[PDB]
């Protein structure tokens with residue numbers, strides 16, 4: 642039975658529960674299978690049921706030999722890499738997730754320039770980071786890429802959800818730009834695969850319910866959380882949380898979770914608290930957020946940003962948010978936490 646929803650709860654194998662997960666954006670960019678297995682086994686033994694990974698890796702020129710990439714976007718043409726240093730790495734991750742009782746969230750483009758993103762489509766096809774949503778050349782490539790990836794794992798019970806993008810924004814755009822794109826893209830996915838969950842991947846910006854007046858609740862980044870969540874072909878909401886990056890205090894975080902949970906409840910769909918992080922005082926600050934998420938109606942799961950581990954190639958990436966397996970912060974925010982759910 643694939644992961645699903647039942648009212649405000651998520652389900653895995655047909656059973657409802659609150660699920661803890663993490664993010665490991667880089668998992669399908671490794672080239673060592675043993676390291677993939679270590680990460681997913683460490684997640685599994687720690688009680689992480691969901692892992693969110695990048696399902697994209699867009700380049701404007703072919704990288705060095707040995708470097709993983711999933712799509713070359715160059716001079717008006719897309720070329721998808723299905724070889725051993727292309728989407729076969731994502732294949733191994735899905736296989737390993739099936740062997741390790743981990744369900745994956747797999748997304749299809751970045752908002753940001755990291756690993757190409759909407760900027761790499763602009764470089765290849767023209768336009769701008771706001772026009773992208775409605776530009777024919779970009780959207781055709783994007784959809785073809787989506788169909789290419791979805792078709793690889795259409796029958797896998799290890800896919801939690803297909804996710805449109807990482808943190809899509811449309812700065813200054815009418816909120817209908819993203820809304821129509823969400824509706825069209827999610828309907829496209831459901832036309833290919835009627836059975837897996839689909840979500841957006843946005844940060845949750847643009848929310849009137851329980852607003853504190855601060856900028857994250859405004860609609861000027863192009864997203865309207867309640868509007869988009871009403872799309873029939875989206876199964877659950879996503880929101881992220883970075884107070885200092887956003888110009889707000891950490892005290893905004895728990896109320897941000899409360900406000901999104903209320904919005905999810907109103908929509909009749911679960912919310913995934915899909916990224917959150919601070920770079921210091923993690924146990925205390927993130928622990929507070931985690932408790933709010935467990936206590937809030939409509940929050941069905943959460944996944945901290947980000948998982949860390951020791952790989953054969955060295956420590957996995959440290960962006961200051963990384964919580965490494967075997968450390969005290971990992972005990973606080975993962976192993977203790979999951980055991981107590």
Ligand SMILES: *[C@@H]1O[C@H](CO)[C@@H](O)[C@H](O)[C@H]1NC(C)=O
Nearest residue numbers: 816817860865867868869871
């Ligand atoms: C956000 O969507 C809600 C519907 O869920 C709508 O009532 C509100 O007007 C929208 N606001 C903007 C600026 O899109």
